[PDB]
Amino acid sequence: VNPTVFFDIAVDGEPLGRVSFELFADKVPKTAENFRALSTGEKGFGYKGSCFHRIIPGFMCQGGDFTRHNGTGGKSIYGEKFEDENFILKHTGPGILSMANAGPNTNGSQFFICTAKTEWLDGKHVVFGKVKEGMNIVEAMERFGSRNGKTSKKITIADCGQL
Amino acid sequence: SMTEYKLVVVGADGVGKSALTIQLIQNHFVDEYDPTIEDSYRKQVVIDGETSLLDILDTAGQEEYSAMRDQYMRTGEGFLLVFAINNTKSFEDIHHYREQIKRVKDSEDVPMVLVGNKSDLPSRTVDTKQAQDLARSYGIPFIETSAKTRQGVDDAFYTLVREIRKHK
Ligand SMILES: CCn1c(-c2cc(N3CCN(C4CC4)CC3)cnc2[C@H](C)OC)c2c3cc(ccc31)-c1csc(n1)C[C@H](NC(=O)[C@H]1[C@@H]3COC[C@@H]31)C(=O)N1CCC[C@H](N1)C(=O)OCC(C)(C)C2
Ligand SMILES: Nc1nc2c(ncn2[C@@H]2O[C@H](COP(=O)(O)OP(=O)(O)NP(=O)(O)O)[C@@H](O)[C@H]2O)c(=O)[nH]1
Ligand SMILES: [Mg+2]
């Protein structure tokens, strides 16, 4: 039973709304479990209170750096980084949830949510979930982005967990 | 008003384009890896007695978007060709960047400076002579730099401005 997790999104501290995700544990169980546990915070660390540091309208919203809060950090539940599990799933359109990385086998905690098809990322980023409810919250985040991804307001995961 | 120079910093992922630029602009060494989308900076400097405004474009090293460099190469007036002295593939990557700028600008006379970065590191794999030989065959200066110690940082950008002034 593929787990479901939620993010409660705030903009400069003001509630925006809830995004929920289905995590594809059936095809990418290690990568899904990392994101699930970071969402509950059950390891004593995780996404709660972290920000979406890069938002590029027309492409994606990226977040998950809860260690440094500057877009360079983040860590998995298995160590600082872990290997690419598989590239079975593709970046087929808006709402795909996929792992950010710094090259092969460098998954940590950073993730991105597609706002468009990004097929040139297929085979380089592990796709592991999809927005299930609240895609319009992600769409709403785009108006805070820019061409190079710098955000004009602080977009935070005010709360998160497992449904 | 002082003359503005549009400088572009290019080279493979991780060679130190941003650390070099941020040292120049902010006098601070970025120890973390924050791979670039695209960033622009401005600094006024004095070079050979003449005050000049440097407009610097710090570009992405991601090879997947190599076809998207044409526009910024058309706009740029001079180019820093950065490799890392401890990364032989970054040195090999230089020729493709140089050929791309030459093709896009359709000229053999483009202001460029070859920059061998990370000179502070002990794991050198690219001989200084090889870089010096390559720069000679291009007709351009070669500057050894360290974004960490600041060695040659000012010289790299200042020399590029001097190459533009001689061309223009
Ligand atoms: C050339 C400009 N340009 C573009 C781009 C490209 C295009 N196209 C390409 C596709 N064409 C179709 C085939 C025809 C149309 C035109 C248009 N306009 C743009 C932008 C807006 O022009 C400014 C991009 C892009 C991406 C990068 C650098 C430059 C880029 C880049 C740098 S680092 C990285 N990519 C991976 C990054 N790594 C880290 O953040 C590491 C940090 C340290 O370790 C943990 C953490 C990461 O995982 N992600 C998660 C995944 C999305 C990804 N970020 C990201 O932001 O992609 C941005 C973008 C816009 C999707 C792609
Ligand atoms: N020791 C040392 N490390 C350096 C030097 N210049 C850069 N670095 C380090 O090398 C790594 C990559 O630097 P960075 O400036 O991000 O390189 P880049 O060419 O801008 N990368 P990208 O193409 O992704 O934008 C960082 O960890 C940075 O601290 C240098 O002169 N010496
Ligand atoms: Mg950079």
Author numbering:
A (entry chain D): 2 to 164
B (entry chain A): 0 to 167
Quote from the publication.
RAS family genes encode small GTPase proteins that regulate cell proliferation in response to growth factor stimuli. Here we describe RMC-7977, a reversible, tri-complex RAS inhibitor with broad-spectrum activity for the active state of both mutant and wild-type KRAS, NRAS and HRAS variants (a RAS(ON) multi-selective inhibitor). The binary CYPA–compound complex then binds to active RAS (with dissociation constant Kd2) to form a tri-complex structure in which CYPA sterically occludes RAS–effector interactions. Although neither RMC-7977 nor CYPA alone exhibited any measurable binding to GMPPNP–KRAS, RMC-7977 makes multiple π–π and hydrophobic contacts with RAS in the switch I (SWI) and SWII region once the tri-complex is formed.
